[PDB]
Design an enzyme around this catalytic site. Structure first.
Site, mmCIF file in Angstrom:
data_model
loop_
_atom_site.group_PDB
_atom_site.id
_atom_site.type_symbol
_atom_site.label_atom_id
_atom_site.label_comp_id
_atom_site.label_asym_id
_atom_site.label_seq_id
_atom_site.Cartn_x
_atom_site.Cartn_y
_atom_site.Cartn_z
ATOM 1 N N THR A 1 0.826 -1.201 0.000
ATOM 2 C CA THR A 1 0.000 0.000 0.000
ATOM 3 C C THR A 1 0.864 1.256 0.000
ATOM 4 O O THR A 1 1.754 1.410 0.836
ATOM 5 C CB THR A 1 -0.945 0.035 1.213
ATOM 6 O OG1 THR A 1 -1.675 -1.195 1.288
ATOM 7 C CG2 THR A 1 -1.919 1.196 1.094
ATOM 8 N N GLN A 2 0.593 2.156 -0.948
ATOM 9 C CA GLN A 2 1.382 3.378 -1.059
ATOM 10 C C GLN A 2 1.078 4.335 0.089
ATOM 11 O O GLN A 2 1.976 4.716 0.850
ATOM 12 C CB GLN A 2 1.122 4.050 -2.408
ATOM 13 C CG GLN A 2 1.834 5.381 -2.577
ATOM 14 C CD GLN A 2 3.343 5.234 -2.613
ATOM 15 O OE1 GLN A 2 3.869 4.203 -3.031
ATOM 16 N NE2 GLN A 2 4.048 6.269 -2.171
#
Lengths: 202, 250, 237, 213, 201, 216, 234, 232, 240
Positions: free
Chosen positions: F1-2
């Protein structure tokens, strides 16, 4: 756009704004932001228009095939979970927020929210969109449990009218849709019929 | 799959390869192809079997194709194998032209084709291409030069060779009546007509039954000319006249 | 015929001849009798040699500190499956930081050995494994036949001439559980002794054991260190 | 932006005696400005003759420790014998270089005994360069510990000083004193200490309290 | 970091400092900067110590394989080309390694240089490291192809001493290697302080 | 997840005799916006192991789904065994480290409480994959607000009763509600003991604002 | 054809492996003896014509400085396995800074052995089992060792073994003349006399290849002069 | 799915692909079809003899177009014809995409021949059991091509595949002119079809496609029966 | 030959003799019976005791493929284990993709399609196992689907697979199982399985019995021990 859904005793009422802007210019001034996934399931889409359209079409595909396989109509929780998986698997490039509401025989009227990120949770009232921020106070001060179909419709219309006249990314007309055992019935509120509130002219 | 495999890509108890033997036999009963070399050019004589009056016959040539700018080919056997082989040869010839900015030497292209044919016989589990190829062309290194290849993947360089029915008789006629180093285009053409008349004696020499092609080098340019029907009629008339003259002198 | 030349064929009697050949090979393998107590599990195998000169190749493999196996059949397939099982055990210790339980290991190897029974041109691993292990649920003994079917057992005998050992195990299975470690290994050694005929002897130089206990990590004993166990042994019956 | 690395602190020290090895490390796990726990020894005993001190990013420390355990087990099954100190050092260097383009942000010290009953301490780097030295300190306070180890154990830069090989008691007292000193000026270490003594008698673990700050 | 190497009539001399620094901090003063690829082949480490060590060890493995396969000691040129290809295939990947490999082969003494950039250069004299720019001066001004063994030894020692003195990334002790027909001989390993006191008096 | 899009705040947890107690608010914050205020950030692994989660909520939902599925698989095995809280802690550690190693991590910090074999376990893992066990654990801002008080009171009393632990956790949640912008007045608490796992629904904390009149 | 590569026998064994063993007895005769002072390997060259160079006819190969190998059977197929064994030994050295143990080398060779099929793995793999019996003589931490590698993958550690055309009978005679306390000189003398007795043709330095591994010295192959020196006494 | 890598089609000792001969026998046993050329176009005709009238003969089609200027008919197996025409449509569309010009009929027939050859020389596959009569118009010229299951092709002015195909060829040869019109071509095609229909042809039982400079188009039963009435 | 060598070919009439041999291989195995009632689905499977050295509950022919779905098998037991693994994998996939437990109808349909998928190619052989899956739902009730080795899944008020399957079916027809009580049906299953068991044919034997239903809170489970002895006593009495 701004999307608002509330469940009543035996069904759900959903509403959406009809504004899509590519910046300061409205791409479509009458856009539809509530899409029927099934005869008793609707998705309120917001965010990237292409992302919302692709997700809605893919979900319609997969859920229709799954319902045909089961030979039975699907469930609101099942559809919401499938949206959750679709959004979580593509949260990097699919940027959208979808409100999943409708009625099923086993659970009744139910609403779920899957905002950007890919997370699923049920809410009695669900709010989404760029204009979603301006109406939390109004919904908290106006919504009480145990509402009926008509008063849910009126409350959703009022909240969405406030959101659209306070948000530059929302405007135009408001599309309402009530889903229950009787079926789906959809109307559009335009111009005068939209609830206009008092203005502090001085 | 053990029982039901055809295992065409394995050896034989006596060391031969039945698939290439059958391909050569089928080529033997297939159409007639002849290639010859002259001091100023190289000539091809191809015989077409299916000669029904329903043919549109619009094509310039049936078993004779143009591999590249300066090299022509004659095929013997399965014409669909011939088409796929010919366009593969054109593809790789143009590939060499792109890679080196020079016309692909005939020996190079023949070696590449024999490589791929040998590999296709070597493995793959498929029946080999039962088509014999006879290539003519001109190059910087050897000029006029013609090769005969086999479905087994073996090729050879010849001054003149024939494939099809009565191949032994045809090559005997070449060995008897070919003037090495002193074969002009006219005498080469006459010898080709003789072979076409003799190696297929059944259904004696006919204009539409065969197609004639020539490859020459004019002004540093390779010219491939397909002799027209009037030309083939002229060849037939010349052959008849020369045979009559020889018989009368006899 | 044609029902015995492939693995994906169905015999009219409802059997697979390749599986029959594998289950014949496991019996044609060397003698190995394994058993357990309430706390400990011990494998006793007699190591065959191609000649008197050969040093009686080891049949008991160390797959984990708490789990051990003994082979009977194709040595290469046995070694491959031993490597596969020890890879699973180390994967479990790396992921969950716990010894991988014996039952799940045996189920995993059974699932692995099921695929060759269906795959075209794929042969069953013609070797049977006696797996002795200890975990949170006490000692466990499993016999994985090359038929890809595993059997949980208190005491199993595999290899040629195993009927006498099987009878001994069936007779004394009521008392295997409550006897202590030395009595348990003596019972297994006597079963292996009865496996062989009278004229041959249970010499220390061609017998090996693999034992895992409540506090004892799976350890293998050879000719010199099985001598204390080969003390006071009765002559061949 | 996501940062795949973070410095969790911790100090590792080792001295290779003529017949013994000592490897000591604080049990302080840190993150930014907050201390997590007072018990997380950086020393992990592989065999009875080899212990590893790993400091730095704790996730890489744990994963590398488990990788070393797994490779130790695989080598043990393959060769039917335990691993030597030099073999472990070479294997760990190969493992470190196997992640050359995603470096392990860990400092490693291999403290153990060879076949000749002699101490051996191997220093490493995040990439995998290794060597054998009599004594090495790494981690947060390596800069605060190396000169004192050089002057005391190695007797470096000293006049009229004969070179007595260090005994176990001398090494233990010295390592206790050097961490007493380190816990003061360095903020990443203190509040406890775990010491592993690798000798032919086995591995002895001793815990000592430090500056609780 | 400072390594030098030069060939002459009686073989090849390689000298190297024994200081490895992690930034402005001396990590160790006992690094064996000269790598013994074979009893007849030598390498060095300059720049990335771990990368140099790993690639030298892999080259040692490859040349041992080649010697076993072809029943011949690997040519120095062949080893240099193999190492250059091996490093070059990962060019622009953060590798920072540079080393000269010398030895005796069918063509007498032979010294080649390779780096992380794939630059494979032969030659008579080479030196790579932080202080190699300094070692150039002394080596080039004192080098002769007909130097005796002792003259080569003390020339290399003096050059390493000067490089370690003037530079700050070079120091510790000098490791000296003489490569002749049979193989390499560890000439000496002398502390820079002892070298300084000997050169001053 | 960024990036974490919706984030739940800190999670607190301590261990008492024969069990552990964990707590976390029921608020899922979309940055500075508290969109969700009744969600559960605590997931029950089994009758002996439980998890509390901070950070992004979608990654928490995915992790809960995966953990529940694999616990279901273990139950379906029916071998008479059960995943120890140590095993759960190790598996979460390994999954987090693999997830970061692919440069697509999980923006979540997890506290793993459990009680098996008469042992009270309290594990800590984060997005970056650091793993350890401590008598007191706290994620996020709780690591700076409650964890100091937790560690001080645990050093004063090495072992404290179940009711003492509950009172301490209530006081710490009070402190976080006072001094954390991402907290909420209503929080969900749970206990893992020999009887099993119990989540005590929604609970609130008492707030004192007497100092508001001291401004002058 | 018809029969596959993964087909057993009615009694439960691979007849392909039985054919491989038959080819083993079709191979050249080789002898290996392990003692406390090292290990010795010998093989008969089976020179077809004098024009063939004896240098290229060598059945004994060096795996490492401390390991020698004797091959019997498909000598062409044995060199691939020999290369694999050498590269694996060097990989072990590269990884653990130590010489690979002979037993582990034999186990890895067994791992490579009996790995073949039609459609069972990557297409670029083996189709038939190795048809070569091997004798791995070596010196390691466990002293001198000798391993009989059977093409079946049933690797054996044996003090002395004779394989090839005259494997049986000669192995029994070697055992009878073999003892448990023989020196290296006694071992080479016994192996040489047994090989000379079992020779199908008059042997000399050009008919046999001899090699040894010692605890102190590396793997050394007997040249012609030392071969004549040791054979003149026999 | 594994996929056999050995070609089912193999060279017999005489070299004849007896499997291809059986494919041609299946073609002959299939429904007959005819094709004919005029001086300014091509006409393809075939019969669709279904079972009793319970089949909706209108619903299914046998003459199929590939482009606006190319159509084809088959003699043999409909299942093979469907996949073959579908692949030919893909090839024509790909050529139009690449070169922005209509597929020449000769090139399309060459691609179909290459596909058939790949099928015959590849493994795990059966040779196609159809013979295609392909009509096309390009560069103001008509083209009619015979393509056999063997993978070869020819440009034939007239052709007749199926039962009594040799007699149909002879009849076409007798009743073929070099410079006939499209009307004469239709007359000849319908005459051959009724001479070899065996069962009293009907406008529904006859389906005909015409290809000329205006393109390719299939005649509907109205003008079909009109031409049958005009031809008798 | 040619018509019975692989599952990818028809008989000259159009039969699949490989599947028929799979049916033979599942018939000759031990018996396995499954009875669904209005408030539960029970399975009683017959275990052959090769030797008394085995454990009770070894080589179980009862698998628990989902949180609420059981699986009673007959035929090749390794094949049965593989099919149970496939079934639980499918259940896991459905749970992940839809957020709730898979219904038994779709589970059985997908598993039967999978089984039939490995009855089409010569590269595989048909499964030598038949299996009955029982589940319960609050909105669906008790459900029981039997699946053939061919790949056909049907709902069964009560089914039997094995040697004495037809006898078990016929004698249990007197039971109106569609509106019966699970607890007493367990005892009746013990009865029927004891009568249909041939003691002379198989002297040593054992029973593995389980149910899933509303009394289980809709989750598959094995019979509690006490009910096991009580049902065993009832079966002994019914042996007469």
């Amino acid at each position: 756009t701004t999307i608002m859904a509330v469940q009543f005793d035996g069904g759900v009422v959903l509403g959406a704004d009809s504004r899509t802007t590519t910046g300061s210019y409205i791409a479509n001034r009458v856009t539809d932001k509530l899409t029927p996934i099934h005869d008793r399931i609707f998705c309120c889409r917001s965010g990237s228009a292409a992302d919302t359209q692709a997700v809605a079409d893919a979900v319609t595909y997969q859920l229709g095939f799954h319902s045909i396989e089961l030979n039975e109509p699907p469930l609101v929780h099942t559809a919401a979970s499938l949206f959750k998986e679709m959004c979580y698997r593509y949260r990097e490039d699919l940027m959208a927020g979808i409100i999943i509401a409708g009625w099923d025989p086993q659970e009744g009227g139910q609403v779920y929210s899957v905002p950007m990120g890919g997370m699923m949770v049920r809410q009695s009232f669900a709010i989404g969109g760029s204009g979603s921020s301006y109406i939390y106070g109004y919904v908290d001060a106006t919504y009480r449990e145990g509402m009926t179909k008509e008063e849910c419709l009126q409350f959703t219309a009022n909240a969405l009218a406030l959101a659209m006249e306070r948000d530059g990314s929302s405007g135009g007309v408001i599309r309402l849709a009530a889903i229950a055992e009787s079926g789906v019935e959809r109307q559009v509120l335009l111009g005068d019929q939209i609830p206009k509130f008092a203005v502090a002219t001085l | 799959s053990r029982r039901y495999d055809s295992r065409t890509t394995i050896f034989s108890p006596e060391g031969r390869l039945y698939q290439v033997e059958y391909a050569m036999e089928a080529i033997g009963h297939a159409g007639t192809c002849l290639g010859i070399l002259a001091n100023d050019g190289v000539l091809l004589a191809a015989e077409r079997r299916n000669i029904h009056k329903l043919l549109d016959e619009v094509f310039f040539s049936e078993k004779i194709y143009k591999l590249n700018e300066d090299m022509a080919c004659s095929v013997a056997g399965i014409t669909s194998d011939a088409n796929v082989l010919t366009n593969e040869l054109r593809l790789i010839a143009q590939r060499y032209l792109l890679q080196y900015q020079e016309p692909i030497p005939c020996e190079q292209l023949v070696t590449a084709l024999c490589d791929i044919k040998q590999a296709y016989t070597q493995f793959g589990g498929k029946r080999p291409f039962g088509v014999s190829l006879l290539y003519i062309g001109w190059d910087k290194h050897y000029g006029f030069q013609l090769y005969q290849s086999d479905p087994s993947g073996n090729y050879g360089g010849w001054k003149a060779t024939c494939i099809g029915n009565n191949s032994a008789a045809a090559v005997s006629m070449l060995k008897q009546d070919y003037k090495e180093g002193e074969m002009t285009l006219k005498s080469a053409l006459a010898l080709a007509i003789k072979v076409l008349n003799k190696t297929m004696d059944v259904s004696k020499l006919s204009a539409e039954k065969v197609e004639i092609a020539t490859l020459t080098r004019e002004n540093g340019k390779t010219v491939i000319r397909v002799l027209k029907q009037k030309e083939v009629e002229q060849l037939i008339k010349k052959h008849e006249e020369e045979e009559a003259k020889a018989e009368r002198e006899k | 015929n044609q029902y015995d030349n492939d693995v994906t064929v169905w015999s009219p009697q409802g059997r697979i001849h390749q599986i029959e050949y594998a289950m014949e090979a496991v019996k044609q393998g060397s003698a190995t009798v394994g058993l357990k107590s309430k706390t400990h599990a011990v494998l006793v195998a007699l190591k065959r040699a191609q000649s008197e000169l050969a040093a009686h190749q080891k049949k008991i493999l160390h797959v984990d500190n708490h789990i051990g196996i003994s082979i009977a059949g194709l040595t290469a397939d046995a070694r491959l499956l031993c490597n596969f099982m020890r890879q699973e055990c180390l994967d479990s210790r790396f992921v969950f930081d716990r010894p991988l339980p014996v039952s799940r290991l045996v189920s995993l190897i059974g699932s692995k050995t099921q695929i060759p029974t269906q795959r075209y041109g794929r042969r069953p691993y013609g070797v049977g494994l006696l797996i002795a292990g200890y975990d949170d649920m006490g000692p466990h003994i499993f016999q994985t036949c090359p038929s890809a079917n595993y059997f949980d057992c208190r005491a199993m005998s595999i290899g040629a001439r195993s009927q006498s050992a099987r009878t001994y195990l069936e007779r004394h299975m009521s008392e295997f559980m409550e006897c202590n470690l030395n009595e348990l290994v003596k019972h297994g050694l006597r079963a292996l002794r009865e496996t062989l005929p009278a004229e041959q002897d249970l010499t220390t130089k061609n017998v090996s054991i693999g034992i895992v206990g409540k506090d004892l990590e799976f350890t293998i004993y050879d000719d010199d260190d099985v001598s204390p166990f080969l003390e006071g042994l009765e002559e061949r019956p | 932006r996501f940062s795949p690395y973070v410095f969790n602190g911790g100090t590792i020290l080792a001295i290779a005696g003529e017949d013994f090895a000592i490897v000591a490390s604080d049990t302080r796990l840190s993150e930014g400005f907050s201390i997590h726990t007072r018990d997380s020894p950086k020393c992990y005993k592989l065999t009875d003759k080899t212990v590893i001190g790993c400091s730095g990013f704790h996730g890489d420390c744990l994963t590398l420790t488990k990788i070393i355990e797994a490779r130790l087990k695989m080598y043990k099954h393959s060769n039917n014998k335990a691993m030597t100190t030099g073999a472990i050092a070479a294997m760990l260097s190969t493992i470190l270089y196997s992640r050359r383009f995603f470096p392990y942000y860990v400092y490693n010290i291999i403290g153990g005994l060879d076949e000749e009953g002699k101490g051996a301490v191997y220093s490493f780097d995040p990439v995998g360069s290794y060597q054998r030295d009599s004594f090495k300190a790494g981690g947060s306070a390596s800069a605060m510990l190396q000169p004192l180890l050089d002057n005391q154990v190695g007797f470096k830069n000293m006049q009229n000083v004969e070179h007595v090989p260090l005994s176990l008691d001398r090494a233990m007292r010295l390592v206790k004193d050097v961490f007493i000193s380190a816990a003061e000026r360095d903020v990443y270490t203190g509040d406890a200490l775990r010491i592993c003594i690798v000798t032919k008698e086995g591995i002895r673990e001793e815990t000592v309290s430090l500056r609780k700050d | 970091t400072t390594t030098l190497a030069f060939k002459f009539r009686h073989g090849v001399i390689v000298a190297a400092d024994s200081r490895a620094t992690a930034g402005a901090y001396i990590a160790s003063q006992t690094v064996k900067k000269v790598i013994e690829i074979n009893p007849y082949l030598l390498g060095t480490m300059a720049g990335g110590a771990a990368d140099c060590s790993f690639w030298e060890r892999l080259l040692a493995r490859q040349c041992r394989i080649y010697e076993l396969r072809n029943k011949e000691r690997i040519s120095v040129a062949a080893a240099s080309k193999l190492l250059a290809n091996m490093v070059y295939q990962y060019k622009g990947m953060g590798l920072s390694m540079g080393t000269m490999i010398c030895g005796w082969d069918k063509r007498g003494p032979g010294l080649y240089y390779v780096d992380s950039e794939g630059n494979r250069i032969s030659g008579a004299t080479f030196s790579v490291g932080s202080g190699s720019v300094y070692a150039y001066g002394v080596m080039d001004r004192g080098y002769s192809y007909d130097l005796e063994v002792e003259q080569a030894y003390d020339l290399a020692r003096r050059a390493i001493y000067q490089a370690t003195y003037r530079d700050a990334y070079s120091g510790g002790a000098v490791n000296l290697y003489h490569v002749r027909e049979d193989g390499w001989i560890r000439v000496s390993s002398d502390n820079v302080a002892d070298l300084h006191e000997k050169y001053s008096g | 997840t960024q990036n974490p899009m919706v984030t739940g705040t800190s999670v607190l947890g301590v261990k008492f005799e024969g069990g552990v107690v964990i707590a976390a608010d029921m608020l899922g914050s979309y940055g500075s916006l508290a969109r969700f205020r009744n969600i559960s950030r605590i997931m029950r692994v089994n009758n002996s192991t439980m998890l509390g989660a901070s950070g992004d909520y979608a990654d928490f939902q995915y992790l809960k789904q995966v953990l529940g599925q694999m616990v279901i698989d273990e139950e379906l095995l029916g071998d008479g065994h059960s995943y120890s809280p140590r095993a759960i802690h190790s598996w979460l550690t390994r999954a987090m480290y693999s997830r970061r190693s692919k440069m697509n991590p999980l923006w979540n910090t997890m506290v793993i409480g459990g009680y098996a074999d008469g042992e009270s376990f309290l594990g800590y893992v984060d997005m970056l994959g650091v793993a350890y066990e401590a008598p007191s654990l706290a994620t996020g801002y709780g690591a700076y607000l409650a964890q100091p008080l937790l560690r001080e009171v645990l050093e004063k009393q090495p072992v404290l009763s179940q009711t003492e632990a509950r009172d301490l956790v209530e006081r710490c949640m009070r402190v976080l509600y006072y001094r954390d912008a991402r907290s909420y007045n209503r929080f969900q608490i749970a206990t893992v003991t020999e009887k099993g796992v119990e989540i005590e629904g929604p609970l609130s904390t008492e707030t004192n604002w007497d100092i508001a009149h001291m401004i002058s | 054809y018809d029969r596959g590569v993964n087909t057993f026998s009615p009694e439960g064994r691979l007849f392909q492996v039985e054919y491989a063993i038959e080819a083993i007895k079709l191979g050249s005769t080789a002898i290996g003896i392990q003692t406390s002072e090292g290990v010795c390997l010998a093989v008969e060259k089976r020179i077809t014509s004098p024009l063939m160079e004896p240098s290229s006819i060598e059945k004994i190969v060096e795996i490492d400085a401390h390991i020698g190998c004797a091959m019997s059977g498909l000598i062409a197929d044995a060199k691939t396995l020999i290369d694999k064994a050498r590269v694996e030994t060097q990989n072990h050295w590269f990884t653990y800074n130590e010489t690979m143990t002979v037993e582990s080398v034999t186990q890895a060779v067994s791992n490579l052995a009996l790995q073949f099929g039609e459609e069972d793995a990557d297409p670029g793999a083996m189709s038939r089992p190795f048809g070569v019996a091997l004798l791995f003589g070596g010196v390691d931490e466990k002293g001198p060792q000798l391993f009989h590698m059977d093409p079946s993958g049933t690797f054996v550690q044996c003090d002395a073994r004779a394989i090839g055309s005259a494997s049986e009978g000669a192995q029994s005679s070697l055992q009878e003349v073999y003892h448990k306390s023989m020196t290296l000189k006694e071992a080479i003398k016994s192996s040489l006399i047994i090989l000379k007795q079992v020779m199908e043709e008059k042997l000399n330095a050009t008919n046999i290849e001899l090699a040894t591994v010692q605890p102190g010295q590396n793997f050394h192959m007997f040249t012609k002069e030392e071969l004549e020196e040791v054979i003149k006494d026999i | 799915e594994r996929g056999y890598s050995f070609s089912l089609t193999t060279f017999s000792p005489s070299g004849k692909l007896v499997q291809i001969e059986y494919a041609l026998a299946a073609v002959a046993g299939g429904a007959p079809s005819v094709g004919i050329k005029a001086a300014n176009g091509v006409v393809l005709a075939t019969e669709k003899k279904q079972k009793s009238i319970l089949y909706d003969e209108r619903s299914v089609h046998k003459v199929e177009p590939i482009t606006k200027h190319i159509g084809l008919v088959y003699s043999g197996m409909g299942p093979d014809y469907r996949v073959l025409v579908h692949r030919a449509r893909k090839l024509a569309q790909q050529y139009y995409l690449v070169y922005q010009e209509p597929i020449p009929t000769a090139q399309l027939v060459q691609r179909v021949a290459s596909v058939m050859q790949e099928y015959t020389q590849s493994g795990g596959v059966r040779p196609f059991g159809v013979s295609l009569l392909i009509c096309g118009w390009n560069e103001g010229r008509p083209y009619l091509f015979q393509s056999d299951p063997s993978g070869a092709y020819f440009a034939w002015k007239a052709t007749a595949m199926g039962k009594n195909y040799v007699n149909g060829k002879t009849f076409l040869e007798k009743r073929y002119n070099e410079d006939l019109e499209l009307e004469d071509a239709i007359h000849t095609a319908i005459l051959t079809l009724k001479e070899s229909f065996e069962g009293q042809m009907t406008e529904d039982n006859i389906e005909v496609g015409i290809c000329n400079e205006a393109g390719f188009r299939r005649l509907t039963p109205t003008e079909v029966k009109d031409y049958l009435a005009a031809i008798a | 030959t040619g018509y019975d060598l692989s599952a990818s070919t028809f008989s000259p009439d159009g039969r699949v003799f490989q599947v028929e041999y799979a049916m033979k291989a599942v018939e000759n195995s031990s018996t396995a019976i499954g009875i669904r009632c209005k408030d539960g689905v029970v399975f009683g499977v017959e275990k052959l005791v090769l030797s008394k050295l085995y454990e009770e509950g070894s080589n179980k022919r009862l698998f628990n493929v989902d949180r609420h779905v059981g699986m009673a098998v007959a035929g090749l037991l390794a094949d049965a284990r593989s099919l149970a693994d496939i079934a639980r994998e499918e259940a896991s996939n459905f749970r992940s993709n839809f957020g709730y437990n898979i219904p038994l109808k779709h589970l059985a349909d997908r598993v039967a399609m999978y089984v039939h998928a490995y009855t089409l190619y010569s590269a595989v052989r048909p499964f030598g196992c038949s299996f009955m899956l029982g589940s319960y739902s609050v909105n669906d009730g008790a459900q029981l689907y039997m699946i053939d080795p061919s790949g056909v899944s049907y709902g069964y008020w009560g089914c039997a697979i094995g040697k004495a399957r037809q006898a078990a079916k016929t004698e249990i027809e007197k039971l109106q199982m569609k509106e019966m009580t699970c607890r007493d049906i367990v005892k009746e299953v013990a009865k029927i399985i004891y009568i249909v068991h041939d003691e002379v044919k198989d002297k040593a034997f054992e029973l593995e019995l389980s149910w899933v239903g509303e009394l289980t809170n809709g989750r598959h489970e094995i019979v509690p021990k006490d009910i096991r002895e009580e049902a065993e006593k009832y079966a002994k009495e019914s042996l007469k």
